[PDB]
Design a protein around this ligand. Structure first.
Ligand code: FAD
Ligand code: FAD
Ligand code: NAD
Lengths: 394, 395
């Protein structure tokens, strides 16, 4: 049997693996799924445990529960390198050989070379990271009562006002009343600051929704600094550029939501990449390779209508996996592949537990309605990978 | 007309104020109660929130709820100094004058000049401090998953194997299963180390109780280093002395339960003190002052039967408050004072939620029996200051 190796059990990888599971037969091919952890986490929900609004266990599921060990062989390890010439993948504790390779290693934070960002700032990109962020913040608040002068303990800087930053500060704003009560903190001293280099919050998004979001978040005490880039990050806080002059913000907590890029393993393995991502062919394969497929955030897709790239999203990542699973099954059976066409049905952004903004099917949504839509959309993914049981289990 | 000032709303202070409240009548004297916070915390239970086994709100109560605003005027401020000559107390936000003074400012950590102990170690002595310790520990465990090589995140060093240290590591051991599950930690990697300079755990205690305690805690993975002093403390951990040679323990968390002293304000105000505490007269008054009284941990009392000093405890602090309240009422009303006589009943040391050791009524006690015994004894104090309602509020 031919061997299929899928790197990364994220949205793209897990859907690809489950897709191959349904389509292929009990001995048609050998499929090995490699993941850093024995669990798959719901990346789109990670902003909530980071703020502490939702327990992290509700944002992950055991991989062994999802798949069939007969059809899929799960390997828990960390990918170190990919050798295209030898068709071998190197791991920290082993090695693997592939006839076909699917790469869904996800994103990495993009710090733009900004000094201290890697060392002194946090990222919302894993279960480990969000627990670290959450416990870090509660630690600072705990320290405050003993040291009332240090309001920097109560200051949280979120760098970048994209979708991730906006959703996170929304959760943060909701958490503050309970958090302040727990540590005897005066709520008025708490500062949640969202710092954006771009002229507007949520750049390249609909102004009606953006203005609405700022109004809602501003109501909950969130501060916005726009047209303000972060020059560098320190243990004491961040340095920002205001009116051509440097200014310092003293903050015990700095969370970086400024940008993402493709996993550096891909670029290090000698692929040609733009911002760490591979601009794949219509069949989602890496250029110059017939056996290598790229999915999720590692994959780059250009829009034919406008020369702008599709953003790296879970929505398109899921669609990558379904397409790759189908094409791989056909390819193994000597069939013909079907070209990938992305179908972006629009997106919804949460603003705390009870509010949201989105454009779905060209139609705007607000408030409780938009909030339920997002919950329904996310529930649909759970059904896709885990069935009705997974939906009920959470 | 006469003004009574009580400093510190701890066991000694709160009982003294409530005692004066019950005994005295309206307008007999002016009573002012000064505290750092608007709440009074049950210091004897603080080890539980520090470990996270019990919520900190269950270990404190609002002062205004306990007292009578008509009889007692509560002031939330921090005492800075006492001027004996002018009979004035200096605060951060004011000044006060007293005809009579009651000092119950409690203990402060005693680090004995050991390097880095004051700066880099934690103390279990307030609601603020235990919340800090608790969140610190959970933070280290959170960091571990990202960095599995750093087992020092999972190492907690508790300095001193006295009553406080033993109770704390007991709570810590109970907490570990829940804590490990929350942060995907392998329980076998967790190290709880209790370091004592003295040759045995719980120095000056009955060996039968000590052996039982070590057996229970040792079973739960608690490590004991005896005859081992702490040379110095760093953010990375501690340096200890083993067989006359320096040795290092890498620990993200260091908690010091090695010793206490009288609140430094007393010493700073020019009183004569031994280890920061005042050796009071039979009426709990400071020597050379007829109007200044000392209660709780600030006071030092020697037992007449055996010339050893009484340990600083909540039990004797409560008795200090009752005695001072009675004597102050008598002095103002022209009555006769009663010399303080301590009646020290037994005490129980918890070993987690479900285990304990104690000598109660001259009889040794263990397990579930001792645990229920301790809970009732502490409940008695809740009744003393808060009545049946406060006892009910702990449900
Ligand atoms: C707070 C937040 C909210 C978001 N909300 C939305 C939303 O609402 N709608 C939407 O469309 N998109 C949303 N996104 C974006 C979406 O989550 C990403 O586009 C999606 O995660 C990308 O899919 P992926 O599988 O390629 O990446 P990932 O989900 O990150 O998958 C990576 C997987 O591979 C593992 N892995 C990574 N590196 C290695 C390695 N060297 N070795 C072994 N295993 C490895 C990882 O452990 C992980 O399991 C959100 C992102 C964030 C941070
Ligand atoms: C974990 C732990 C467990 C214990 N278990 C027991 C036990 O089981 N049995 C027993 O008998 N004893 C026990 N003790 C000892 C007991 O708690 C103390 O002896 C008792 O608290 C002493 O009474 P106190 O009022 O003098 O001190 P405290 O209780 O500390 O009272 C001090 C009060 O004054 C306030 N204060 C302090 N400084 C200032 C300032 N400058 N300005 C304004 N306010 C100030 C404080 O905020 C506090 O309210 C335990 C101690 C600890 C740490
Ligand atoms: N609801 C959703 O559909 C959803 C939710 C989260 C993420 N996403 C997708 O995931 C991808 C990643 O999201 P993201 O928010 O992390 O990145 P992003 O690129 O979408 O936005 C990050 C923002 O950071 C700002 N920034 C960059 N450098 C800065 C600096 N030095 N100082 C201050 N601000 C700076 C940029 O202007 C940018 O707007 C996006 O393409 C996004 O579309 C989608």
């Amino acid at each position: 049997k031919p061997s299929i190796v899928i790197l990364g059990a994220g949205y793209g990888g897990i859907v690809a693996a489950l897709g191959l599971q349904k389509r292929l037969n009990y001995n048609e091919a050998d499929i090995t799924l490699v993941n850093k952890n024995d669990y798959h986490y719901i990346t789109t929900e990670l902003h909530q445990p980071a703020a502490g609004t939702m327990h992290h266990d509700q944002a992950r599921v055991g991989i062994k529960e999802l798949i069939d060990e007969k059809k899929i062989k799960f390997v828990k390890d960390t990918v170190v390198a990919i050798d295209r010439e030898q068709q071998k993948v190197t791991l920290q504790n082993g090695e693997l050989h592939y006839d076909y390779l699917v790469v869904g290693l996800g994103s990495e934070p993009e710090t733009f070379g900004i000094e201290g960002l890697r060392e002194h700032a946090f990222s919302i990109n894993s279960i480990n990271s969000v627990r670290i962020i959450r416990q870090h913040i509660e630690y600072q608040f705990a320290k405050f009562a003993a040291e009332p002068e240090r309001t920097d303990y109560l200051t949280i800087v979120v760098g970048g006002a994209g979708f991730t930053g906006i959703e996170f500060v929304g959760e943060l704003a909701d958490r503050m009343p309970e958090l302040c009560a727990e540590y005897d903190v005066d709520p008025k001293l708490v500062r949640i600051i969202n710092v954006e280099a771009a002229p507007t919050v949520l750049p390249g998004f609909d102004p009606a929704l953006v203005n609405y979001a700022m109004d809602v978040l501003g109501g909950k005490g969130v501060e916005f600094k726009i047209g303000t880039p972060i020059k560098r990050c320190t243990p004491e806080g961040v340095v920002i550029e205001v009116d051509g002059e440097e200014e310092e913000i003293k903050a015990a907590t700095v969370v970086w939501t400024g940008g993402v890029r493709g996993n550096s393993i891909v670029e290090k393995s000698g692929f040609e990449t733009m911002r760490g991502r591979i601009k794949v062919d219509p069949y989602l394969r890496a250029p110059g390779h017939e056996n290598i497929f790229i999915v999720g955030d590692c994959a780059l897709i250009i829009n034919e209508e406008n020369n702008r790239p599709y953003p790296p999203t879970a929505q398109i990542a899921i669609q990558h996996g379904e397409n790759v699973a189908a094409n791989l099954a056909a390819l193994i059976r000597g069939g013909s592949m079907t070209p990938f066409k992305p179908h972006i049905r629009g997106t919804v952004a949460s603003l705390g537990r009870n509010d949201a903004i989105g454009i779905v099917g060209g139609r705007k949504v607000y408030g409780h309605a938009a909030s339920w839509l997002k919950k329904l959309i996310d529930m649909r993914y759970l059904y896709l990978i885990g069935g009705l049981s997974l939906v009920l289990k959470k």
